[PDB]
Write a protein that binds this ligand. Structure first.
Ligand SMILES: Nc1ncnc2c1ncn2[C@@H]1O[C@H](COP(=O)(O)OP(=O)(O)OP(=O)(O)O)[C@@H](O)[C@H]1O
Ligand SMILES: [Mg+2]
Ligand SMILES: [Mg+2]
Lengths: 147, 76, 985
């Protein structure tokens, strides 16, 4: 696991992710803290979201545990930071890098999926009253994702 | 060339291959027909476990050959 | 009336109907040597109605080579008489008897007749009767490293289950007018041509829901065809299909008919020309015995081999067998005729016992009809095997010396083995080692470790443990039992109660491992297997791995510097469902069971742990306010479980349970339907509640309903357990308390600054001080499936079935709920016997020190379908480092405890490589991209000092080495893999 994790870390170091920056916590290779920048064409524009990544002992044969630490008002992210992403529960394969997961999370932030939601109330607001959803998302990203 | 794969649970699979195909192509076909990733497949022919990077003709796998698809178990 | 407290794991393999039929079947076993006693033991453990033994031959010393119920004080007594008493203890529901004489007409009392150690004329006489009276007949034989099985279940045997797999079921998306059934998105039906299916909940084609099975024509992994459904309708939408398994008729031939034209089962496709040879060889053995007063050929005797080959020629000519006899193989069969190996006995006894169960249950596909097996690759080549070395010495190992010789016996007697685990496979392995004579010499020793204790369900397949042993340590009982079997093991076995893992490296350290000869795993999880594999790779020890699941099993061997390790390959991982599916949209009973388990944890475990931690840690609140993902939840839990909803009697527990029923089965469903009404549509215009999403309906509490009352009882009992109150089970109090309940009004909410922190502080200071509550604790509920009085499985079953009723899912019973929630692994004694036999057949290869990789075999089998297969182990990959051949697995660098700078300079000067990353354990000791100040601080330190500083933990005194992982680049910048580093402290 150590060699795979270091190869991913070095690859991240070589080519910057631009919109993301992941690295080990202190000196522990099995605990990373990533940062995601809110997309410009999204309600979360100008926001910094912190994620915690926990690599299991069986990496890359088991998915990393990725949890949001910043509060976000999204139909697919609940109050515990759990992310409704298929590649993290049962579609994980030992061929996906952390950069791919970060790109998937950014794509999820750029457009939510209310047809298969994790938070039914936010999904209902999104489907019925779009403007209220926009206002709530901007308020939340100003209150929590900035500062 | 047509070959048969028998699983440890009794299922039978028919594959259309050629003698020049590599083991990787056979594993990809098995994944298409079963969804088992190639890295988790254990294929046995005539007491030899087939390894990636080699061809069928390396194992003398001819038409109507039977392979076994096996796996390890965690109980006991 | 099956005792599920004992047959728990076996019922998940066989079923209730199968065991009901088993409990009405009589088994006669002729012969009480190692093979016969193995078969009888497995049958007694399985649970047949009764067993009868017939073996009037007096005991001899050599019989102790594989008969573990015989002692040296029993010499001269008939074998059955001395074996019956010890067999009667294995299972209390199975009587065991002895008959001093057999008559043909007496055979009509038995469902199955097993024959061992009987001549061919007697076998013909017995089978001529059993065949025409429709009695199952099995005949088994074990000669040295050769074995044979024959099954004859009659001309009209009916098999109800042919593979032992669960029926296949799936969700449909559409059925066209021509019967082309299509699965949901990216879902495989898994059917085969000729299968039968039945449909339900099909909309648009009401005629398919009657329940008539239909033929299946597979047209791809996602679609199949059922025929023409023109009349029933034009097109069908949604619905589910379930496979229908139909009985089959198998016709067997008598032994007399099948001697001329046998039908073979091939255990190995690598040697397909041998079974025809063994068919002649075993008949020649019978003829030779008939011509010499029942005496077999003497070990490694050339005159007897020549006479035996003449008999083989005569038989082959008589049967018109157009097969060229392989003289070497046939004479090998002659040489080992008097061999009697406990490993072969275990393997064949497991197989034969499974066949007996098939005969008595009409389940699984039986062997049809001849099964000839050999393990001739186990014959030693590093010692002398001749007539002088293989002659009997008048000891209990004569049956093994007749095959391997006395020098190999000396090699076996000085083994130093390490057995990890003491379960079913561990017990079988210890028995095999005791019979083989392992570690009975001056320099021999056995070490067995296991941290578990004996339970009632373990007695069904761990035959070394008795009901009096429940609650004691497994390793101690196993060591005592095997010391009883072979008294020479007294003082040669050491038992530990330690779990093998990172925390026990002070006990199983360098000194412990340096003295071993081999390691055998008998574990039940992959984490421990990987850990032991890494330890064996580091110390360069042989490893024997084995695993079972129901009727399936496998065995693997890891040989230093020859093969790959256990962890070089990947197995399919466990399936975990999406969180969105479990939270809101379940469609299977498994989803509801997972939800119920999470509910159990969230109601009776987490809040109690939070309350207990609040009353112990002095700085719990401040740490939790910024550590946990929801401090508000923790504060609410503490408040509710301390002050707000603390029960003072059991009536308050009942009221709490009623409130929780409303919360989790009536109000959340109403909120969900408020968010997504049943008439709502997706963004593409499709209905929302279609396909995998099932529209739920709220539950109204009815006391007369069984599931509602079960949930209330279980929840109230568990709450009382948490608060230490006196629970009750009389329905009168429940009906009286719940009668006067006024539900609080509920209305779904439509939604529509920094004061929240002030509110959290106000809640925090409202809690009673920890000093006011000293010595007060709440008992958390720790999940336990094997106890039927703690209300754990009862609560999970009730909650799961209530949530299934919410979403119109078919509820399950306590049996399936316990299987799913408990993560129970189905287990069988027969599979355990087979895997132990295979492992002990590989062990003698390891002892002989065989170097070629074609001489080892990894084995796989499924007893439900009678499939056996073997394959050579995969050789360890090689690589080129600095123009040298390096083993990717078994090679390492050995360096002193130098500084980081000296290590880097050594790798630059010696290997011509630039070090880029250096890590140890779970820490990054060195990276090429670290800032220069940090490096300059970390460069002049020794590796041990650097590890201690970075990990902030001093090295233990028993620590004698460090393992480092290094990633380095070549001169051109190409990354080159290198073996790990072993720093000597
Ligand atoms: N890390 C470990 N170190 C030592 N022994 C272990 C370890 N992990 C598991 N075992 C032991 O391995 C044995 C596994 O055998 P088995 O699964 O048949 O037994 P069990 O777990 O007690 O039974 P069951 O799973 O049927 O309830 C058990 O004795 C278990 O205690
Ligand atoms: Mg146990
Ligand atoms: Mg277990």
């Amino acid at each position: 696991a150590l060699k795979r994790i270091n190869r991913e870390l070095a690859d991240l170091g070589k080519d910057p992710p631009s919109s993301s920056s992941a690295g080990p916590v202190g000196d522990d290779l099995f605990h990373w803290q990533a940062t995601i920048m809110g997309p410009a064409d999204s309600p979360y524009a100008g926001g910094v979201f912190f994620l915690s990544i926990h690599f299991p002992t069986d990496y890359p044969f088991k998915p990393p545990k990725v949890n949001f630490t910043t509060r976000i008002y999204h139909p697919n992210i609940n109050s515990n930071g759990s992310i409704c992403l298929d590649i993290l529960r049962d579609q994980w394969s030992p061929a996906l890098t952390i950069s791919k997961v970060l790109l998937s999370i950014s794509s999820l932030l750029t457009d939510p999926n209310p047809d298969d939601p994790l938070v039914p109330e936010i999904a209902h607001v999104y489907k019925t009253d779009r403007s209220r959803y926009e206002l709530s998302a901007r308020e939340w990203t100003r209150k929590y994702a900035i500062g | 060339m047509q070959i048969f794969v028998k699983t440890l649970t009794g299922k039978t699979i028919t594959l259309e291959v050629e003698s020049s195909d590599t083991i990787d192509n056979v594993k990809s076909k098995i994944q298409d027909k079963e969804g088992i990733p190639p890295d988790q497949q254990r294929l046995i022919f005539a007491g030899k476990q087939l390894e990636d990077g080699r061809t069928l003709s390396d194992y003398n796998i001819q038409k109507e050959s039977t392979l076994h698809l096996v796996l390890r178990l965690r109980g006991g | 009336t099956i005792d599920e407290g004992l047959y728990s794991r076996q019922l998940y393999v066989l079923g209730h109907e199968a065991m009901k039929q088993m409990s009405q079947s009589n088994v006669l076993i002729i012969g009480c040597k190692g093979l016969g006693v193995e078969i009888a033991k497995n049958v007694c453990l399985a649970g047949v109605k009764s067993v009868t033994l017939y073996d009037p031959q007096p005991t001899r010393i050599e019989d102790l080579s594989s008969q573990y119920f015989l002692t040296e004080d029993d010499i001269g007594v008939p074998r059955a008489k001395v074996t019956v008493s010890k067999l009667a203890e294995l299972n209390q529901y199975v009587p065991v008897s002895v008959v001093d004489e057999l008559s043909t007409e007496y055979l009509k009392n038995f469902k199955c007749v097993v024959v061992t150690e009987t001549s061919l004329t007697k076998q013909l006489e017995i089978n001529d009767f059993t065949h025409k009276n429709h009695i199952a007949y099995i005949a088994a034989d074990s000669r040295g490293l050769f074995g044979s099985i024959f099954c004859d279940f009659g001309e009209n045997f009916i098999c109800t289950d042919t593979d032992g797999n669960e029926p296949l079921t799936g969700m449909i998306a559409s059925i066209t007018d021509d019967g082309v059934v299509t699965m949901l998105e990216e879902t495989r039906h898994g059917l085969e041509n000729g299968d039968f299916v039945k449909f339900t909940e099909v909309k648009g084609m009401p005629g398919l829901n009657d329940g008539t099975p239909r033929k299946v024509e597979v047209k791809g992994p996602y679609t199949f065809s059922i025929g023409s459904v023109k009349d029933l309708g034009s097109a069908g939408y949604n619905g589910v299909f379930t496979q229908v398994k139909v009985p089959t008729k198998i016709s067997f031939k008598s032994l007399r008919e099948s001697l001329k034209d046998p039908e073979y089962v091939y255990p190995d496709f690598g040697k397909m020309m041998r079974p025809p040879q063994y068919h002649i060889a075993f008949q020649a053995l019978s003829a030779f015995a008939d011509a010499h007063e029942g005496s077999l050929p003497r070990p490694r005797n050339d005159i007897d081999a020549a006479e035996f080959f003449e008999f083989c020629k005569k038989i082959a000519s008589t049967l018109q067998f157009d097969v060229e006899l392989d003289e070497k193989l046939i004479k090998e069969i002659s040489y080992q005729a008097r061999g009697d190996l406990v490993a072969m006995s275990a393997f064949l006894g497991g197989a034969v016992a499974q066949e007996v169960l098939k005969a008595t249950t009409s389940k699984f596909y039986p062997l049809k009809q001849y099964f000839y097996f050999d393990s001739l690759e186990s014959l030693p080549s590093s010692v002398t095997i001749s007539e002088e070395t293989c002659k009997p010495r008048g000891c209990r190992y004569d049956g093994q010396i007749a095959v391997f010789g006395s020098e190999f016996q000396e090699k076996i007697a000085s083994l130093s083995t390490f057995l990890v685990g003491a379960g079913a496979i561990g017990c079988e392995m210890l028995k095999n080692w005791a019979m083989m004579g392992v570690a009975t010499g001056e320099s021999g020793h056995i070490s067995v470790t296991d941290m578990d204790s004996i339970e009632k369900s373990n007695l069904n397949r761990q035959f070394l443990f008795r009901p009096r042993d429940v609650g004691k340590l497994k390793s101690e009982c196993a060591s005592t039992a095997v010391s009883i079997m072979n008294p020479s093991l007294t003082g040669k076995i050491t038992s530990y109660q330690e779990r093998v893992g990172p925390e026990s490296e002070g006990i199983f350290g360098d000194e412990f491992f340096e003295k071993l000869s081999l390691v055998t795993n008998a574990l039940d999880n992959v984490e421990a297997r990987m850990y032991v594999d890494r330890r064996c790779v580091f110390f360069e020890k042989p490893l024997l791995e084995s695993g079972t699941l129901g009727t399936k099993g496998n065995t693997q061997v890891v040989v230093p510097h020859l093969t790959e390790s256990y962890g070089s390959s990947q197995d399919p991982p466990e399936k975990s469902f999406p969180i969105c599916t479990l939270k809101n949209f379940p469609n299977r009973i498994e989803h509801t069971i997972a939800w119920a388990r999470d509910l159990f944890e969230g109601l009776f475990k987490q809040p109690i742990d939070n309350v207990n931690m609040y009353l112990s840690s002095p700085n719990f609140l401040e740490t939790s306010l910024k550590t946990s993902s929801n401090p508000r939840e923790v504060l609410e839990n503490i408040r509710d479980y301390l002050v707000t909803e603390k029960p003072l009697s059991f009536e308050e527990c009942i009221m709490w349970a009623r409130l929780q029923f409303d919360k989790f089965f009536n109000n959340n469903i109403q909120q969900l339907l408020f968010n997504f009404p049943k008439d709502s549509v997706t963004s593409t215009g499709q209905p929302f509640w279609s396909g995998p999403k099932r529209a739920p309906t709220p539950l109204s509490f009815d006391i007369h309903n069984r599931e509602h009352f079960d949930f209330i009882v279980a929840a109230a009992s568990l709450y009382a357990f948490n608060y230490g109150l006196k629970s009750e089970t009389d329905p009168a109090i429940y009906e009286r308390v719940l009668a006067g309940y006024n539900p609080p009004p509920f209305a779904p909410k439509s939604g529509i600054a920094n004061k929240d922190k002030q509110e959290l502080k106000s809640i925090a200071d409202s809690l009673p001080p920890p000093s006011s509550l000293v010595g007060f604790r709440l008992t958390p509920a720790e999940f336990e499936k094997d106890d039927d009085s703690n209300h754990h499985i009862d609560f999970i079953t009730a909650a799961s079935n209530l949530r299934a009723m919410n979403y119109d899912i078919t509820p399950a019973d306590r049996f399936k709920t316990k299987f799913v929630a408990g993560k129970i692994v189905p287990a069988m004694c027969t599979s355990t016997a087979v895997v132990s036999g295979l492992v002990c057949l590989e062990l003698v290869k390891l002892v002989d020190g065989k170097k070629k990789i074609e001489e080892y075999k990894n084995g796989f089998f499924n007893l439900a379908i009678g499939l056996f297969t073997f394959s050579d182990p995969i050789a360890s990959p090689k690589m080129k480092v600095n123009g040298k051949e390096i083993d990717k697995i078994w090679d390492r660098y050995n360096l002193p405890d130098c500084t980081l700078q000296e290590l880097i300079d050594y790798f630059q000067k010696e290997e011509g490589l630039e070090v880029t990353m250096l890590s140890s354990g779970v820490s990054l000791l060195y990276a090429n991209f670290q800032p220069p100040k940090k490096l300059a601080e970390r460069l002049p330190l020794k590796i041990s000092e650097l590890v201690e500083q970075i990990t902030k933990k001093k090295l233990e005194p028993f620590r004698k080495h460090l393992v480092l992982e290094i990633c380095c680049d070549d001169a051109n910048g190409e990354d080159v893999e290198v073996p790990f580093i072993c720093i000597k402290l």
